[PDB]
UniProtKB/Swiss-Prot annotation, chain A:
It comes from the Archaea. Residues 587-645 are annotated as: Metallo-beta-lactamase C-terminus. It comes from Thermococcus kodakarensis (strain ATCC BAA-918 / JCM 12380 / KOD1) (Pyrococcus kodakaraensis (strain KOD1)). This is Transcription termination factor FttA. Terminates transcription on the whole genome. Termination is linked to FttA-mediated RNA cleavage and does not require NTP hydrolysis. Cleaves endonucleolytically at the RNA exit channel of RNA polymerase (RNAP); the 5'-3' exonuclease activity of this protein degrades the nascent RNA released from RNAP. Residues 6-73 are annotated as: KHa. Belongs to the metallo-beta-lactamase superfamily. RNA-metabolizing metallo-beta-lactamase-like family. FttA subfamily. Residues 393-586 are annotated as: Beta-Casp. InterPro entries: aCPSF1, Beta_Casp, KH_dom, KH_dom-like_a/b, KH_sf_prok-type, MBL, Metallo-B-lactamas, RibonucZ/Hydroxyglut_hydro. Zn(2+) 1 binds at residues 250, 252, 338, 361. PANTHER family: CLEAVAGE AND POLYADENYLATION SPECIFICITY FACTOR, CLEAVAGE AND POLYADENYLATION SPECIFICITY FACTOR FAMILY MEMBER. The keyword Metal-binding applies.
UniProtKB/Swiss-Prot annotation, chain C:
Its main location: cytoplasm. This is Transcription elongation factor Spt4. Keywords: Chromosome, DNA-directed RNA polymerase, Metal-binding, Transcription, Transcription regulation, Zinc. The Stp4-Spt5 complex stimulates transcription elongation on both naked DNA and histone-bound DNA (chromatin), facilitating transcription through the histone barrier. Neither protein functions alone. The complex also stimulates the transcription termination activity of FttA, neither protein alone stimulates FttA-dependent termination. Signal peptide: none annotated. It is found in: Chromosome. The gene is spt4. It comes from Thermococcus kodakarensis (strain ATCC BAA-918 / JCM 12380 / KOD1) (Pyrococcus kodakaraensis (strain KOD1)).
Swiss-Prot record, chain D:
InterPro entries: KOW (IPR005824), NGN-domain (IPR005100), NGN-like_dom (IPR006645), NGN_dom_sf (IPR036735), Rib_uL2_dom2 (IPR014722), SPT5 (IPR039659), Spt5_arc (IPR011590), Translation_prot_SH3-like_sf (IPR008991). The Stp4-Spt5 complex stimulates transcription elongation on both naked DNA and histone-bound DNA (chromatin), facilitating transcription through the histone barrier. Neither protein functions alone. The complex also stimulates the transcription termination activity of FttA, neither protein alone nor the KOW domain of Spt5 stimulates FttA-dependent termination. CDD domains: KOW_NusG, NGN_Arch. Keywords: Chromosome, Transcription, Transcription regulation, Transcription termination. It comes from the Archaea. One of its GO terms (biological process) is transcription elongation-coupled chromatin remodeling. Coiled coil: none annotated. It is found in: Chromosome. Disruption phenotype: Essential, it cannot be deleted. GO terms for cellular component: chromosome. PANTHER family: SUPPRESSOR OF TY 5, TRANSCRIPTION ELONGATION FACTOR SPT5. This is Transcription elongation factor Spt5.
Length: 645, 98, 65, 147
RNA sequence: UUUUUUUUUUUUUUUUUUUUGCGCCGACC
DNA sequence: ACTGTCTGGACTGGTCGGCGCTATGATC
DNA sequence: GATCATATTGTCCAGACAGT
C-alpha cells in the first residue's frame, strides 16, 4: 500500500529543528515502534531540563526517546565506572549492558527509583556525563528464570529487535492522523462461550486483533478448541498481512494460548502489545502448556522457538501510557485487577471518533494483591465486558469471612500437628493465599514453614519483579517501608524430589501450596498420595474441580480411590484426611461487581457488549443491564460483526 | 600495487609449517620430520645422526636388514633398534662424511 | 543490479534499452540465455517463442516477472 | 550446431556462462550460443560445432570442471526455451513441497490454482486447522500428483 | 397456450513433579 | 586337459607415552 | 566490514580365467 512515512518524518524533523536549539546537533530522526527516536551530538543542550522534552512530546504527541550519536560513545568500562559513580550506592546496580549499534545502556538495579530520579533528572545527568541513553529495569529480589531468559534473548538478538522495531514504526506511521470511515467489531472466538477468545477490530485503514487465545476444555474437538480461522475477514487480513498489531488483555491460556501458533506458521509478523508481567506470565504458561501436551503424548501445538519469536515480537507498555499502534487507532492500558499485569484494553480510534474499552477478566472490589479495575476513562462509547459470573443467582461469597474460615481451618489443622495441602493455580489465587498467610503469620499466629512447589516460586518471583503492578498496600509496604511481604522467611522452595520426601516424612507441621488444583499432575498428586492416609492432615480446595479429575473425586467424599500403581497394578488410596472447600478466592468479578462496574463507569457507554461467558449467562447479564440502566446491550455469537461507527 | 595485493604468503607458510610439523612430506612420504628426543645428551645426538629406510617395517628384508660390508666407517654396526626397525633404521658412523 | 526488458527480454545495466528503447525493465528474471550467433538453433527457437528476442546477439531472459 | 553440457559449480552457473561468453567475445572463440536455465543446477548448455571448441572455451576457468562427452538432441532442450508459467501444470488436490518462501521445508496440499496472477493457494498438511496461504508458483515443487 | 428437486435435538479442566577418529614417530616385554 | 595371467587378501598380541590435524571463496 | 552454500570422484599364496 501507499505510505507517507517519509513526509511525516521530514515534517517532524522540521518542527524539531524549529523548536530545538541549533547547538544540539540533530543528526538522525527515525521511528522505533510507537515512539520517536532523535539522535543528537550535544545532549547537554538538548536536555538541560525536562521542560523541553515535555514540550516536544506535547507538540508532537509522541514518546520522545533522545539518544546520543553513535560516534560520540564512551568506552564501555569507563561508561560503567561513570554510571556506578553517578548512581547513589543505595540503588544496588547488578547488571549493566551496552548496545554498540544504537546508543543505549541497560541498567539492572534493585531500586530503579534512585537510578531514574525524582523527576527523571538522574537519567538526563547520566546520558549527559556519559553520553549513553539509560534504560532502567528492576532486579527482582527473587531470581526468575523466565525473566532472565527473556532479557538474555532480547540482548542477544539486538539487531533483529532493532530491525523489527524500525519496520513496526514505519508501518504504524504510513500516514498521518486519519479519520476512519467506519469501525467494525467481529468476534472470532469467546463470544457466548468461555475460552478461545478472539476479538478483531476492523477499520478502513488498520486491523487490530485482541486477546488471541485457545480453549483447553474442548481441546479434543478442533472446531471448538481454536478461534474461527475460517472467517472471511480474518482470512483476508492474514493472507494480505494487514494485521497491524495484537494486544493481549492478560496472561491466560484463553487469552494468549494461540499466540505462538501464528508465528509457528509465519502467519503474523507485527508487534504484540502486552504489559511486561503479562508477557512473562504468558511465556511461562505457554511453555507449561507445551510441556504438558508433550508429556500427554499428543502432538504439541507449537514449539519453544515460536514462544521465543513471540518474545522477540512483543512491545511492552505500562499502565496509563498512550501509544500510537495504527494510523487511526491509539492504544492505552489500564489496571484490571484480575491477575498480575492484567490490563483493560482501551482503543481510541480516530481523533475522537470512537472509543472502545475491552475489560476482559477483571475485578472491581479491592483485593490483597491488586487495586480494583479502572472505571474512569477520558472518553467511552462502547464497552466490552466479561460475563463469567453474569447469572442472576451467581453471587460469590465475600473475601473476609472466606479468609477467616481458611485461617481457622489451617490453625485447627496445625494445632493437632497435621499438614495443610492447598492445591492451587500457578497464578492468581495462589499468590492471594500466600499474602493472606503472610499477613496472618506476621502477627505471630503461625510459625510453621510454607512450602511452594512447581510454578508457585516462579510466579512469586515474577510478582516480586513488578511491585508497581500490585495493590496500594503492598506498594506502600515495599516502597515507603523496608518490608517485602513476599520475602518472608516462612516461604520456602523445594528444589528436588528428595526435599519433597523429607518434607513429607517430617513430623513437624507445615503448609504446602502445590501447583495443580485438580490433582491431575505435578507435585500435588504425590503430596496427596503421601498425606492422604494421615487423619491429622487436611486438604483445602480453592478452585472449582472439573468432573473426571482426581480432585473432584476427593472433594465429593470418596474415602478410597483406585489408581494405577508404579508396577502396573491397581492401588488404593485411603483418604483419611479432612477435606475442605473454600471457593471465595476467585479473581473473577461477581454479578454484583459487574452491576456496580456498569453503574459506576464514567463516562456512560452508548452500548455494552457481553462476552466471555456462557450463552444464557451473557443473555441474562445483557437483559439485566438493559432493564436496570437502559443502555442498549447485545450478546452476539461467533462470526458476528457489529458496526459501531 | 596490483601484483603485490594478489600474493598471499599464508598459503605457502601454512603448507611448509604443516609439512614440517606433521612430518608428512608431499608425495606420500611419512615420518620425514620427528620430534627431537631430549631424554639425555645421547638421545639428541643419536636422533640428529639418524638414517632411515623407505622400506616397509613389516616385510622381512633379509638382504636389506643385515649389516653390509660397505657400511664400514659409514653406518654404525651395533646401534640398531629392536623389532620391526631392526636393520632398517641406522645411525651414521663417527668417521662418516656426507 | 541487472534488469531485463519486458519487451525484447534483454538484460542491460542502464536505464536505456539498446534494442527497443523501452522504459519498463524488470529486476526479476530467470533462465538467462546468452546469444552469440544470430543463426543459432536456440536463438531461432526463442525467435518463434518471443518475436522480439534474438534480434541482436547478447544476454536474454526466457521469462520476465 | 550441437548442444554440449558443461559441469560447473552449483548455484554459480550464470557467472560462469557470462565469463565464457566474455572470453569467447574477446578471443573470437567459435561459440554459437550459451543456454543456462535456472532450474538446472550445476550444468549449462553451450552450442558449438564441435566439443573441441567447448573444451578450449571452458579451460582456464576454475569454475568450469569438464564437458560431458556427448551430444544432446535439440528436442531434449527444446522445452527449456519455451516460456511457460510455473503455476501451469498444477491441479488442486495433490501434495506439493515449498522449496522457498516463509514456509520453507513444509508440505502442503493445493487448494486453488489461478494462472492469471501466477499464484497458487495451498493448505499446510501439518496444521491442526486449515489455513490457506498464497505462495508463488515457482516456489513449490510437486511431490505427488493426485486429482 | 406450459414440462422434471428437496427440508429439523445428547462427550467435561483455561492446565501439572563425562575428547571420538586419522596417521606418524620413538620405546618396553 | 595343462599353463601362464589377473585379482583379492593378510600382513604376532599387549603396554608406555608424544605430536599434530579435522574450511573457504563471494556477495550484501 | 558480516554470512552462505559448497565443497572431486608390496612379496607371496590361492582362486578364477583366457589361451593352446
Ligand atoms: Zn479469560
Ligand atoms: Zn527492450
Amino acid at each position: 500500500r501507499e505510505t507517507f512515512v517519509d513526509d511525516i518524518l521530514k515534517e517532524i524533523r522540521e518542527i524539531i529543528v524549529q523548536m530545538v536549539p541549533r547547538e544540539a546537533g540533530i543528526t538522525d530522526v527515525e521511528f522505533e515502534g510507537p515512539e520517536l527516536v532523535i539522535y543528537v551530538k550535544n545532549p547537554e543542550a538538548m536536555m538541560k531540563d525536562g521542560e523541553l522534552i515535555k514540550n516536544l512530546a506535547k507538540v508532537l504527541k509522541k514518546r520522545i526517546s533522545v539518544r546520543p550519536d553513535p560516534d560520540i560513545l564512551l568506552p564501555p568500562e569507563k561508561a560503567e565506572e561513570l554510571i556506578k559513580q553517578l548512581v547513589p550506592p543505595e540503588a544496588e546496580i547488578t547488571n549493566i549492558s551496552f548496545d554498540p549499534s544504537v546508543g543505549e545502556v541497560l541498567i539492572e538495579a534493585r531500586k530503579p527509583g534512585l537510578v531514574i530520579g525524582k523527576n527523571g533528572e538522574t537519567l538526563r545527568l547520566i546520558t549527559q556525563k556519559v553520553h549513553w541513553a539509560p534504560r532502567v529495569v528492576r532486579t527482582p529480589p527473587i531470581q526468575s528464570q523466565t525473566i532472565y531468559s527473556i532479557r538474555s534473548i532480547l540482548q542477544t538478538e539486538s539487531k533483529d529487535r532493532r530491525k523489527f522495531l524500525r519496520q513496526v514504526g514505519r508501518n504504524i506511521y504510513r500516514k498521518s492522523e486519519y479519520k476512519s470511515r467506519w469501525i467494525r467489531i467481529t468476534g472470532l472466538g469467546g463470544f457466548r462461550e468461555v475460552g478461545r477468545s478472539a476479538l478483531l477490530v476492523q477499520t478502513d485503514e488498520s486491523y487490530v486483533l485482541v486477546d488471541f487465545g485457545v480453549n483447553i476444555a474442548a481441546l479434543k474437538d478442533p472446531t471448538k478448541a481454536y478461534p474461527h480461522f475460517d472467517a472471511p475477514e480474518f482470512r483476508y487480513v492474514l493472507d494480505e498481512g494487514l494485521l497491524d498489531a495484537i494486544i493481549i488483555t492478560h496472561a491466560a491460556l484463553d487469552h494468549s494460548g494461540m499466540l505462538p501458533y501464528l508465528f509457528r506458521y509465519k502467519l503474523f509478523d507485527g508487534p504484540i502489545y502486552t504489559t511486561p508481567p503479562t508477557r512473562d506470565l504468558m511465556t511461562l504458561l505457554q511453555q507449561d502448556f507445551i510441556e504438558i501436551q508433550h508429556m500427554n503424548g499428543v502432538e504439541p501445538l507449537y514449539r519453544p522457538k515460536d514462544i521465543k519469536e513471540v518474545i522477540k515480537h512483543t512491545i511492552t507498555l505500562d499502565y496509563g501510557e498512550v501509544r500510537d499502534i495504527a494510523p487511526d487507532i491509539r492504544l492505552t492500558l489500564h489496571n484490571a485487577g484480575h491477575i498480575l499485569g492484567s490490563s483493560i484494553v482501551h482503543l481510541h480510534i480516530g481523533n475522537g471518533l470512537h472509543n472502545i474499552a475491552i475489560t476482559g477478566d477483571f475485578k472491581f472490589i479491592p483485593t490483597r494483591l491488586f487495586e480494583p479495575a479502572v472505571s474512569r476513562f477520558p472518553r467511552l462509547e462502547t464497552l466490552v465486558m466479561e460475563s463469567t459470573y453474569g447469572g442472576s443467582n451467581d453471587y460469590q461469597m465475600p473475601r473476609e469471612e472466606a479468609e477467616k474460615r481458611l485461617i481457622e481451618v489451617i490453625h485447627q489443622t496445625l494445632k493437632r500437628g497435621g499438614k495443610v495441602l492447598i492445591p492451587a493455580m500457578a497464578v492468581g489465587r495462589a499468590q492471594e493465599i500466600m499474602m493472606v498467610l503472610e499477613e496472618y503469620a506476621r502477627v505471630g499466629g503461625i510459625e510453621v514453614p510454607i512450602y511452594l512447589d512447581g510454578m508457585i516460586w516462579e510466579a512469586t518471583a515474577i510478582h516480586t519483579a513488578y511491585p508497581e503492578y500490585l495493590s496500594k498496600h503492598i506498594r506502600e509496604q515495599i516502597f515507603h517501608e523496608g518490608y517485602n511481604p513476599f520475602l518472608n522467611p516462612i516461604f520456602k522452595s523445594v528444589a528436588n524430589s528428595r526435599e519433597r520426601q523429607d518434607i513429607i516424612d517430617s513430623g513437624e507441621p507445615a503448609i504446602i501450596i502445590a501447583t495443580s488444583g485438580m490433582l491431575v499432575g505435578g507435585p500435588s498428586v504425590e503430596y496427596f498420595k503421601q498425606l492422604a492416609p494421615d487423619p491429622k492432615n487436611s486438604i483445602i480446595f480453592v478452585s472449582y474441580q472439573a468432573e473426571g479429575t482426581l480432585g473432584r473425586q476427593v472433594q465429593r467424599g470418596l474415602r478410597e480411590i483406585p489408581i494405577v500403581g508404579e508396577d502396573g497394578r491397581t492401588e488404593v488410596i485411603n483418604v483419611n484426611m479432612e477435606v475442605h472447600t473454600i471457593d471465595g478466592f476467585s479473581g473473577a468479578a461477581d454479578r454484583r461487581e459487574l452491576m456496580s462496574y456498569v453503574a459506576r463507569v464514567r463516562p456512560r457507554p452508548e452500548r455494552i457488549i457481553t462476552v466471555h461467558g456462557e450463552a444464557h449467562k451473557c443473555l441474562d447479564l445483557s437483559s439485566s443491564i438493559h432493564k436496570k440502566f437502559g443502555i442498549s446491550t447485545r450478546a452476539p455469537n461467533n462470526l458476528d460483526a457489529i458496526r459501531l461507527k | 600495487r596490483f601484483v603485490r595485493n594478489s600474493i598471499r604468503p599464508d598459503v605457502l607458510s601454512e603448507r611448509i609449517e604443516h609439512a614440517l610439523a606433521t612430518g608428512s612430506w608431499p608425495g606420500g612420504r611419512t615420518g620425514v620430520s620427528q620430534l627431537l628426543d631430549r631424554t639425555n645428551y645421547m638421545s639428541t645426538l643419536s636422533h640428529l645422526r639418524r638414517v632411515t629406510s623407505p622400506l616397509s617395517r613389516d616385510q622381512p628384508h633379509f638382504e636389506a636388514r643385515d649389516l653390509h660390508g660397505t657400511h664400514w666407517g659409514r653406518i654404525c654396526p651395533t646401534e640398531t633398534p629392536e623389532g620391526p626397525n631392526c636393520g632398517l633404521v641406522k645411525n651414521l658412523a663417527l668417521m662418516s662424511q656426507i | 543490479k541487472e534488469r531485463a526488458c519486458r519487451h525484447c527480454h534483454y538484460i542491460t545495466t542502464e536505464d536505456r534499452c539498446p534494442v527497443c528503447g523501452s522504459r519498463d525493465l524488470s529486476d526479476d528474471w530467470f533462465d538467462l540465455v546468452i546469444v552469440l550467433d544470430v543463426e543459432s538453433r536456440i536463438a531461432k527457437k526463442l525467435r518463434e517463442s518471443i518475436p522480439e528476442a534474438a534480434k541482436v546477439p547478447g544476454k536474454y531472459a526466457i521469462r520476465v516477472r | 550446431g550441437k548442444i554440449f553440457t558443461v559441469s560447473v559449480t552449483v548455484g554459480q552457473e550464470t557467472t560462469t556462462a557470462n565469463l565464457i561468453y566474455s572470453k569467447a567475445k574477446t578471443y573470437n572463440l567459435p561459440l554459437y550460443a550459451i543456454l543456462s536455465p535456472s532450474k538446472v543446477k550445476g550444468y549449462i548448455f553451450i552450442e558449438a560445432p564441435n566439443k573441441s571448441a567447448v573444451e578450449e572455451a571452458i579451460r582456464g576457468i576454475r569454475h568450469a570442471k569438464r564437458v560431458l562427452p556427448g551430444e544432446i538432441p535439440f528436442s531434449e532442450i527444446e522445452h527449456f526455451l519455451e516460456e511457460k508459467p510455473a503455476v501451469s501444470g498444477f491441479e488442486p488436490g495433490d501434495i506439493v513441497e515449498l522449496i522457498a518462501g516463509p514456509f520453507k521445508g513444509e508440505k502442503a496440499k493445493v487448494v486453488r490454482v489461478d494462472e492469471s496472477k501466477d499464484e497458487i493457494v495451498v493448505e499446510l498438511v501439518s496444521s491442526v486447522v486449515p489455513i490457506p496461504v498464497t505462495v508463488r508458483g515457482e516456489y513449490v515443487r510437486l511431490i505427488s500428483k493426485r486429482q
